[PDB]
Design an enzyme around this catalytic site. Structure first.
Site, PDB file in Angstrom:
ATOM      1  N   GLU A 165      44.002  35.513  43.410  1.00 15.40           N
ATOM      2  CA  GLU A 165      43.404  34.314  43.983  1.00 15.40           C
ATOM      3  C   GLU A 165      42.057  34.612  44.621  1.00 15.40           C
ATOM      4  O   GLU A 165      41.852  34.362  45.801  1.00 15.40           O
ATOM      5  CB  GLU A 165      44.318  33.648  45.006  1.00 15.40           C
ATOM      6  CG  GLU A 165      45.648  33.171  44.413  1.00 15.40           C
ATOM      7  CD  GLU A 165      46.490  32.243  45.290  1.00 15.40           C
ATOM      8  OE1 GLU A 165      46.223  32.256  46.509  1.00 15.40           O
ATOM      9  OE2 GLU A 165      47.402  31.523  44.796  1.00 15.40           O
ATOM     10  N   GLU A 354      52.887  33.122  40.031  1.00 19.03           N
ATOM     11  CA  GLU A 354      53.586  32.563  41.166  1.00 19.03           C
ATOM     12  C   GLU A 354      53.899  31.078  40.992  1.00 19.03           C
ATOM     13  O   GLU A 354      53.059  30.268  40.582  1.00 19.03           O
ATOM     14  CB  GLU A 354      52.788  32.600  42.464  1.00 19.03           C
ATOM     15  CG  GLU A 354      52.355  33.986  42.915  1.00 19.03           C
ATOM     16  CD  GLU A 354      51.444  33.985  44.140  1.00 19.03           C
ATOM     17  OE1 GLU A 354      51.290  32.907  44.814  1.00 19.03           O
ATOM     18  OE2 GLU A 354      50.837  35.073  44.375  1.00 19.03           O
TER      19      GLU A 354
END
Length: 447
Positions: A165, A354
């Protein structure tokens, strides 16, 4: 009636080091920027910190036992750079390295495939003192760190992610300043985004140069951004939204360029970038898959009053079920996102690095956690994933966030994402029903 996933499909669960490890100042570990950010009142909900967290640094053996019982095939975890190099460069802290060597060996011995993330947000503070990710030298230090890791673990760890991220580290950590290191400067945030992409490139190049016998990729936060209406200005606002959040990282990585509409926007706000064009060739090194973290979807309207020309459509948002994060539940969002990736990036291999959700969990007088809202969410989102495999997307793995309840960054311990409950006073683990459910999902390769 029952859905069944492809035959080789990888069922996994995920964590990150600062969120579960604790032992923040043991065995010579250097301060990270999240230690520093967590030690300042006002930054974290309730003054929580990662000092102890789930104490996984001590309890990994219990945690592996739990994984084996649920039956996960891959365990995604991150390595703490400041445990390996306390000062970020210089001399190597063998105690920290042995930790991960041991961990990886115990996983393989219990039949669990390691998936390692090299950077999940814990830059050594010593490097932050010299500018952190704004300083291009950090991209070389990252490569030196990656080298040690590839040298000791490369061939026996089948799945690697350079970064988690980079968009969040960028926006929240250097623009909004609500994440470590708490900087608030648009331009700094964009230099950072670029150096993160660079560092990824350099590690991919290194990985090939060491001919590591495994698959490397990167894990991006992605979400489908829907236009508020069919009107042209809303279509364009949503596409701008997605360019700033998603294409800003996808396009350099998978097509060797930044998206043009986002560069337009930042030009209007006084910011032009001079990237050595050889950097974009570094950044777009071929990778073996693209991974993403997804939880929700966005709804976006044209908005001339906004700094960016767009903003959320709160009218539409008000109408869905929300998690304990305030995030909409919308499983079709995962299908549309999966299809978008397949169509726009040449049918790549895709990992969901995720997926998960947070609801208020209580232990009943029966000693169990009956988290049916989480089971429903997972059922719903996994049905949409499955649907997308049917319609021809190359989705190879799903990692459920999270194995353990954990330190959820600015929200502290108030938001539980685990399939295993953690009491943060006693450090005791209790498998929740979502966990028991996932166990069955894995057994059957579906539901």
């Amino acid at each position: 009636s029952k859905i069944t996933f492809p035959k080789d499909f990888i069922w996994g669960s995920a964590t990150a080091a600062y969120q579960i490890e604790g032992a923040y100042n043991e065995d010579g570990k250097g301060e990270s920027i999240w230690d520093r950010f967590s030690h300042t009142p006002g930054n974290i909900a309730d003054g929580h910190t990662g000092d102890v967290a789930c104490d996984h640094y001590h309890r990994y053996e219990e945690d592996i036992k739990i994984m084996k019982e649920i039956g996960i095939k891959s365990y995604r975890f991150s390595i703490s750079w400041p445990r390996i190099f306390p000062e970020g460069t210089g001399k190597l802290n063998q105690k920290g390295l042995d930790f991960y060597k041991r961990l990886t060996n115990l996983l393989l011995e219990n039949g669990i495939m390691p998936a390692i993330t090299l950077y999940h947000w814990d830059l050594p503070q010593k490097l932050q003192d010299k500018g952190g990710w704004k300083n291009r030298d950090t991209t070389d230090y990252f490569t030196e760190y990656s080298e040690v890791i590839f040298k000791n673990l490369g061939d026996i760890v089948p799945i690697w992610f350079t970064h988690n991220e980079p968009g969040v580290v960028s926006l929240l950590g250097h623009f909004l300043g609500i994440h470590a290191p708490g900087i608030k400067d648009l331009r700094t945030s964009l230099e950072v985004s670029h150096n993160l992409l660079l560092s990824h490139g350099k590690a991919v190049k290194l990985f090939r140069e060491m001919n590591i016998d495994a698959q490397i990729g990167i894990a991006l936060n992605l979400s489908y951004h829907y236009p508020a209406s069919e009107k042209a200005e809303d279509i364009e606002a949503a596409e701008l939204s997605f360019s700033l959040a998603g294409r800003w990282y996808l396009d350099p990585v998978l097509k060797g360029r930044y998206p043009e509409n986002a560069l337009k926007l930042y030009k209007k706000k006084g910011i032009e970038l001079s990237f050595p064009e050889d950097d974009l060739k570094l950044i777009s090194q071929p990778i073996d898959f693209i991974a993403f973290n997804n939880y929700s979807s966005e709804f976006i309207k044209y908005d001339p009053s906004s700094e960016s020309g767009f903003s959320p459509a709160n009218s539409i948002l008000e109408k869905f079920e929300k998690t304990d994060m305030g995030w909409i539940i919308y499983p079709e969002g995962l299908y549309d996102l999966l299809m978008l990736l397949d169509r726009d990036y040449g049918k790549p291999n895709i990992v969901i690095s995720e997926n998960g959700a947070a609801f208020k969990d209580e232990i009943g007088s029966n000693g169990k956690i009956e988290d049916t809202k989480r089971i429903q969410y997972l059922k719903d989102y996994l049905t949409q994933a499955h649907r997308a495999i049917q319609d021809g997307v190359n989705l190879k793995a799903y990692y459920l966030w999270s194995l353990l309840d954990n330190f959820e960054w600015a929200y502290g311990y108030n938001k539980r994402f685990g399939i295993v409950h953690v009491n943060f006073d006693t450090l005791e683990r209790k498998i929740k029903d979502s966990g028991y459910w996932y166990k069955e999902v894995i057994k059957n390769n579906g539901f």
